[PDB]
């Protein structure tokens, strides 16, 4: 029945609470790190260390 019949398939769904918590956490941390580095680079900046 490659010759007379057929049926569709789908992509593998990731319904796991652990990896969904990890994905949402890491994406939130990365976007807030990118936002704060962009705003500290395009403005007046301070530094805990000398010339940092």
């Amino acid at each position: 029945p490659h010759t007379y019949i057929k049926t569709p398939t789908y992509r593998e769904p990731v319904s796991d609470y652990q990896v969904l918590r990890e994905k949402a956490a890491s994406q939130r941390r990365d976007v807030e790190r990118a936002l704060t580095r962009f705003m500290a680079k395009t403005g007046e900046t301070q530094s805990l260390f000398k010339d940092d």
Binding site: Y17, Q18, R21, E22, A24, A25, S26, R29
Partner: protein, 393 residues
């Protein structure tokens, strides 16, 4: 607060007579020469002495005193005579004591003479011994009255003894030459049969009596339980008595003082007592918040004996994390207001853990950083600023 301030520098003198207080570097004749810490401790001591006057003369008579003062003032407040009657709106000490004596028939002049006119707090050092032969409890209460902030107490003193037959109150007369006070003790027939031991309130509980002495019935002793004097108590119980007082007492100040006294006994039974307090809802939440820091101190003192994980970590994952993921914290729902306070105070105490090398372990620091990363607050009706601020702490 007041016993710390009065033992630190001199004492607060309510109602001075015009210097009356020369132990301190400012003059107490005017409010604008007082130190600000003295002003704060003045208001604090004034409301505690009013609680003492309520203890001697009951609360309904106290509210009748206040209503009589307000009623004289409000009959005064409507006249037009220029102060023939407008000075009934001004209270004095003699007028207040006279109104108290009018409504009650008792005068409080010894209590006023001790706690108002005299400027000192008392220090109690207690130690007991149980006489098995005559079945008595020999208390030994001595006062430190030679410190700069202290004074000598000669009144009566309440003591509450929890024995196997229940909770009994005793009044002791502590004169100047007194040292040994023999009070009688009851049976120990609730160790013959397993019966429940009745508490300070009407209830009764099952206690594990394996830690108790075989010859003594008494489970714990509390000197001045109702805080009826301005005092600092230093009682010398045994560590199992402090653990029984932490577990089964129905008074929050006794649970707090047993937490404070269990830091000197780092035995694993005290760790079990504080961990059972921490796991226990229907305990007052500010006792569990103190048991966190007490458990951290005890855990720091019994390194090279601690068996499993660091303290409170497994308990945090049992109470506040997911069942399927132990290292992922649950999403924030702060609607309980007691597990919110306990959740935001438990890593702050957990970070005071130290290893054998005096460095915080990388299992607790990693746990705190995972608490910070996996924090999701898009679902509760409350803000997250104090919890995140405590995470930084």
């Amino acid at each position: 607060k007041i016993v710390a301030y009065e033992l630190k520098t001199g004492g607060v003198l309510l109602h001075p007579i015009f210097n009356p207080a020369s132990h301190l570097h400012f003059s107490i004749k005017h409010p604008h020469t007082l130190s600000w810490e003295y002003y704060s401790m003045f208001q604090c001591k004034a409301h505690l002495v009013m609680r003492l006057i309520e203890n001697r003369i009951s609360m309904e008579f106290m509210l009748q005193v206040f209503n009589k003062l307000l009623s004289l003032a409000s009959t005064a407040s409507s006249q037009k005579f220029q102060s023939h009657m407008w000075s009934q709106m001004l209270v004095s000490t003699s007028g207040f004591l006279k109104s108290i004596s009018n409504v009650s028939g008792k005068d409080i002049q010894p209590l006023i003479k001790q706690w108002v006119d005299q400027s000192g707090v008392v220090k109690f050092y207690g130690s007991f011994a149980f006489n098995r032969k005559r079945n008595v409890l020999e208390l030994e209460i001595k006062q430190d009255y030679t410190s700069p902030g202290t004074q000598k107490y000669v009144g009566p003193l309440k003591v509450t003894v929890q024995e196997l037959d229940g909770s009994f109150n005793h009044t002791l007369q502590i004169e100047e030459n007194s040292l040994k006070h023999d009070i009688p003790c009851h049976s120990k027939s609730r160790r013959n049969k397993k019966k429940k031991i009745p508490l300070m309130n009407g209830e009764e509980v099952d206690m594990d009596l394996s830690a108790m002495d075989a010859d003594s019935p008494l489970l714990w002793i509390r000197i001045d339980p109702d805080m009826s004097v301005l005092r600092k108590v230093e009682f010398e119980q045994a560590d199992f008595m402090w653990q029984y007082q932490l577990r089964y007492e129905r008074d929050v100040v006794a649970q707090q003082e047993s937490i404070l006294a269990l830091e000197k006994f780092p035995t694993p039974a005290s760790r079990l007592a504080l961990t059972d307090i921490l796991e226990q809802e229907q305990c007052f939440y500010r006792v569990r918040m103190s048991a966190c820091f007490c458990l951290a101190k005890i855990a720091n003192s019994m390194v090279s004996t601690w068996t499993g994980p660091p303290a409170m970590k497994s308990l945090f994952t049992r109470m506040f994390c997911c069942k399927s993921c132990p290292n992922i914290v649950k999403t924030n729902n702060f609607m309980s207001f007691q597990s919110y306070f306990l959740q935001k105070t438990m890593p702050v105490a957990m970070a005071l853990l130290r290893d054998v090398h005096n460095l915080c372990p990388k299992e607790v620091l990693t746990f705190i950083l995972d608490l910070i990363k996996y924090n999701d607050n898009r679902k509760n009706k409350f803000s997250d600023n104090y919890y995140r601020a405590e995470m930084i702490d």
